[PDB]
mmCIF file as gemmi writes it, N, C-alpha and C atoms, coordinates in Angstrom:
data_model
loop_
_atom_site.group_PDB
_atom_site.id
_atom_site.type_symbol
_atom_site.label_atom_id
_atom_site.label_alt_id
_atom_site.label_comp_id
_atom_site.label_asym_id
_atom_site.label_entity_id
_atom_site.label_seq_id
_atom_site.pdbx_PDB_ins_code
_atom_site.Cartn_x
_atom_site.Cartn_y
_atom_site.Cartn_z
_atom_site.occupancy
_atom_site.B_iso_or_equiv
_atom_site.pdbx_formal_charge
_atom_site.auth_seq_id
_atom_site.auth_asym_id
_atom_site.pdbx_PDB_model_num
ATOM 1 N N . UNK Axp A 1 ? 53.575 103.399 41.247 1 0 ? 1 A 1
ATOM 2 C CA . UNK Axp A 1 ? 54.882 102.937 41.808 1 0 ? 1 A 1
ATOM 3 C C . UNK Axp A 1 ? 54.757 101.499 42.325 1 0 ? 1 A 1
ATOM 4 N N . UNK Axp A 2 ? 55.561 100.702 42.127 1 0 ? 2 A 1
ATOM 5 C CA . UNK Axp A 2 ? 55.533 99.191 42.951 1 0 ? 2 A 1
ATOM 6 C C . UNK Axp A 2 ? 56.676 99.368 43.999 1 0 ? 2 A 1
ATOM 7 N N . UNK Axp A 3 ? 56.717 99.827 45.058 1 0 ? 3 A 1
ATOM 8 C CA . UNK Axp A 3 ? 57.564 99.953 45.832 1 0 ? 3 A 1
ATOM 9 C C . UNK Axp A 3 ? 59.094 99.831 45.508 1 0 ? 3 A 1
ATOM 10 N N . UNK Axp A 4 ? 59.114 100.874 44.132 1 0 ? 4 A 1
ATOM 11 C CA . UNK Axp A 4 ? 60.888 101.21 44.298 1 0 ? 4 A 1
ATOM 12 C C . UNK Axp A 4 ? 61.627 101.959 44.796 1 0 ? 4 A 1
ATOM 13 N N . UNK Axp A 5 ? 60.658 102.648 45.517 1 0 ? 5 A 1
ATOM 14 C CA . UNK Axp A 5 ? 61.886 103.384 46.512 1 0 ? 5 A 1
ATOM 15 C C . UNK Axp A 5 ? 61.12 103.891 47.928 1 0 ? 5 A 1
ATOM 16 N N . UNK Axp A 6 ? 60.156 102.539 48.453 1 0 ? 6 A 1
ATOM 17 C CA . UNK Axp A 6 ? 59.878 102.145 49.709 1 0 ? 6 A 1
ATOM 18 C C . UNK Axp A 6 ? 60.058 101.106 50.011 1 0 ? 6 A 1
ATOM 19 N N . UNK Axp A 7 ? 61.787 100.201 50.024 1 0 ? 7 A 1
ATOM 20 C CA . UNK Axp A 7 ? 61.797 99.492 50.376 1 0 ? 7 A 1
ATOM 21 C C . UNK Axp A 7 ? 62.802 98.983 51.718 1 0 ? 7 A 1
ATOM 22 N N . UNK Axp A 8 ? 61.607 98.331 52.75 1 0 ? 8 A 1
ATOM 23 C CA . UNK Axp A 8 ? 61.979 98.472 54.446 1 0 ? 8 A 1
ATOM 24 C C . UNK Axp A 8 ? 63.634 97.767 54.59 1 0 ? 8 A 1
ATOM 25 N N . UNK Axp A 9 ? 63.393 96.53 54.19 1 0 ? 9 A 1
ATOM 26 C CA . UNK Axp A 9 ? 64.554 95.711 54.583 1 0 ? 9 A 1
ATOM 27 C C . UNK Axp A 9 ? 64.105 93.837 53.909 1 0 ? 9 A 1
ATOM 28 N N . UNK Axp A 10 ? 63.731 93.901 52.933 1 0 ? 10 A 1
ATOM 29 C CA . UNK Axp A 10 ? 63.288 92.852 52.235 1 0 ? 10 A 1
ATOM 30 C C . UNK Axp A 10 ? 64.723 92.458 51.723 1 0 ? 10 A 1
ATOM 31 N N . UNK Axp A 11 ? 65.45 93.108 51.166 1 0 ? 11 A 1
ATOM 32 C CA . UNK Axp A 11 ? 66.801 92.292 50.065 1 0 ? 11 A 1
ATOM 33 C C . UNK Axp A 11 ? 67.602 92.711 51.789 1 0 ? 11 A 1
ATOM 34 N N . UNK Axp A 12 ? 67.223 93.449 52.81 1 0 ? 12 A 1
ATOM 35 C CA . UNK Axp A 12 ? 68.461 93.386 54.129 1 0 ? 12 A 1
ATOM 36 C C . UNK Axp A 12 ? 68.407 91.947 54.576 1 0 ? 12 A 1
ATOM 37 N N . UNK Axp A 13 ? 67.57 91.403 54.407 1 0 ? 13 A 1
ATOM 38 C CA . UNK Axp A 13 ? 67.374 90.203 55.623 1 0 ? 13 A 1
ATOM 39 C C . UNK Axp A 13 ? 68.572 89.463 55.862 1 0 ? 13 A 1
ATOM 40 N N . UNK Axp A 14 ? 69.381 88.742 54.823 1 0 ? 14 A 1
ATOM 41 C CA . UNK Axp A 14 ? 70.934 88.031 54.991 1 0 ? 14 A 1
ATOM 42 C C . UNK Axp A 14 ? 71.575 89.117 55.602 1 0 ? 14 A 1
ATOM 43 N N . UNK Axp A 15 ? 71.49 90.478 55.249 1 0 ? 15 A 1
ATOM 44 C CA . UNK Axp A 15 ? 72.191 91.63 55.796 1 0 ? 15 A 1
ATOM 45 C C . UNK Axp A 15 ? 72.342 91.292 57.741 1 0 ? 15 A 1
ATOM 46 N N . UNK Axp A 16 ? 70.868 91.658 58.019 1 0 ? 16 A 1
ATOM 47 C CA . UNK Axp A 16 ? 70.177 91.751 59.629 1 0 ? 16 A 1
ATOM 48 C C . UNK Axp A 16 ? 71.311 90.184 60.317 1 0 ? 16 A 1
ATOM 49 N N . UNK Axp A 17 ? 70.864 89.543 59.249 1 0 ? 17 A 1
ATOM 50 C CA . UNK Axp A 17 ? 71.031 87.771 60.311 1 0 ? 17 A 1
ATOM 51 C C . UNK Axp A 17 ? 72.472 87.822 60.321 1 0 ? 17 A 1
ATOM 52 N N . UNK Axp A 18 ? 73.502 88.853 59.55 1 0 ? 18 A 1
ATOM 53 C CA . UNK Axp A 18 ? 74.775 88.627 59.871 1 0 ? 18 A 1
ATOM 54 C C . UNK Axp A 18 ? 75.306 89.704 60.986 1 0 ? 18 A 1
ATOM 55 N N . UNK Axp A 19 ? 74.033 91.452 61.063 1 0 ? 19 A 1
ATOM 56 C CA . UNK Axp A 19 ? 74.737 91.899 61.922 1 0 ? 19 A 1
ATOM 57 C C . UNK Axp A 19 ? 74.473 91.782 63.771 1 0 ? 19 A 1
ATOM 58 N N . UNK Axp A 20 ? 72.859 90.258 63.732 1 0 ? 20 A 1
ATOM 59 C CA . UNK Axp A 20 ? 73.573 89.542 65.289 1 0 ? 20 A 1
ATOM 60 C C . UNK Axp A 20 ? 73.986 88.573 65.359 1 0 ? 20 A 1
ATOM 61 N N . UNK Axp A 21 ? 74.861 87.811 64.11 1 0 ? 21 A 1
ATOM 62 C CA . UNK Axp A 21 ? 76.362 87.519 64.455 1 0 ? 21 A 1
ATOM 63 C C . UNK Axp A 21 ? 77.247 88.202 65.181 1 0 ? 21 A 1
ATOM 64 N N . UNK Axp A 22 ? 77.864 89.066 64.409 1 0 ? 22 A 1
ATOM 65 C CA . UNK Axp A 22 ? 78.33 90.435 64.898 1 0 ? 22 A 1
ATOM 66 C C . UNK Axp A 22 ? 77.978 90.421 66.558 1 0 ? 22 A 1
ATOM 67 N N . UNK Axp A 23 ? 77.143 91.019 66.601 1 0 ? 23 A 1
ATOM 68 C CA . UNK Axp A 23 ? 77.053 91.356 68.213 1 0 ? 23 A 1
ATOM 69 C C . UNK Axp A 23 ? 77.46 90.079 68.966 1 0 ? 23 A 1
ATOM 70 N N . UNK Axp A 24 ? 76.738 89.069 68.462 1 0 ? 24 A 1
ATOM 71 C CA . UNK Axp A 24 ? 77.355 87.755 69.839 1 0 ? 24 A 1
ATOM 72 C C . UNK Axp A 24 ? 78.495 87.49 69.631 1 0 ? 24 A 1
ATOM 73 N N . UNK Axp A 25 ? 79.416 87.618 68.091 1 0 ? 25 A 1
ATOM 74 C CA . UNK Axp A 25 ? 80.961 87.888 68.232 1 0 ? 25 A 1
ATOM 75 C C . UNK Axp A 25 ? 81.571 88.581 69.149 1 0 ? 25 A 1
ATOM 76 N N . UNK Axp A 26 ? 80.621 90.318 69.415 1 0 ? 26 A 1
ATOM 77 C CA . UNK Axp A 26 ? 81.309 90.669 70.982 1 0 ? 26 A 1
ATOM 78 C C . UNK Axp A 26 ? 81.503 90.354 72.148 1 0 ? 26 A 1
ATOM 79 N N . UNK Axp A 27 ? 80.047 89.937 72.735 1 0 ? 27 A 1
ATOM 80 C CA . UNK Axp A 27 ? 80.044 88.814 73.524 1 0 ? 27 A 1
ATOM 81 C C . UNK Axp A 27 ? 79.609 87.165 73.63 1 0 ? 27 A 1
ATOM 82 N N . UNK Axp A 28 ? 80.641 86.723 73.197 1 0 ? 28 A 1
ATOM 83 C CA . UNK Axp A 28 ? 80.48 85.063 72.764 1 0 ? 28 A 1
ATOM 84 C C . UNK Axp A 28 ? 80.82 84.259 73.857 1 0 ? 28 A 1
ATOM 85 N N . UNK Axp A 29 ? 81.694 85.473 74.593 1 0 ? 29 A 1
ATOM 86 C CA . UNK Axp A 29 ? 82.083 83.938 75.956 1 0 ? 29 A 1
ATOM 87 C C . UNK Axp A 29 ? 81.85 84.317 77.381 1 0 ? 29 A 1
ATOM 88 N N . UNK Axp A 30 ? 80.662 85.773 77.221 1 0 ? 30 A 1
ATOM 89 C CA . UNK Axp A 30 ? 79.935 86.381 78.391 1 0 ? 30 A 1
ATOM 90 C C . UNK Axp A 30 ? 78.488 86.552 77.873 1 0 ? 30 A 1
Protein backbone atom coordinates (compact mmCIF):
# COMPACT_ATOMS: atom_id res chain seq x y z
CA UNK A 1 0.00 0.00 0.00
CA UNK A 2 1.48 3.66 -0.44
CA UNK A 3 -0.73 5.31 1.88
CA UNK A 4 -4.15 5.30 0.06
CA UNK A 5 -6.25 5.09 2.54
CA UNK A 6 -4.00 6.45 5.52
CA UNK A 7 -4.16 9.68 4.69
CA UNK A 8 -3.89 12.31 7.95
CA UNK A 9 -4.53 15.72 6.44
CA UNK A 10 -1.82 16.26 3.67
CA UNK A 11 -4.37 17.44 0.60
CA UNK A 12 -6.49 19.18 4.19
CA UNK A 13 -3.89 21.72 4.72
CA UNK A 14 -5.64 24.82 2.46
CA UNK A 15 -8.70 23.04 4.10
CA UNK A 16 -7.21 23.64 8.12
CA UNK A 17 -5.76 27.37 7.13
CA UNK A 18 -9.34 28.34 6.04
CA UNK A 19 -11.17 26.72 9.04
CA UNK A 20 -9.02 29.42 11.56
CA UNK A 21 -10.21 31.94 9.37
CA UNK A 22 -13.47 30.87 10.26
CA UNK A 23 -13.02 30.99 13.90
CA UNK A 24 -11.34 34.58 14.03
CA UNK A 25 -14.37 35.52 11.68
CA UNK A 26 -16.28 34.77 15.03
CA UNK A 27 -14.29 36.68 17.01
CA UNK A 28 -12.57 39.41 14.91
CA UNK A 29 -13.39 42.42 16.97
CA UNK A 30 -13.02 40.59 20.57
Amino acid sequence: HSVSHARPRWFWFSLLLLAAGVGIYLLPNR
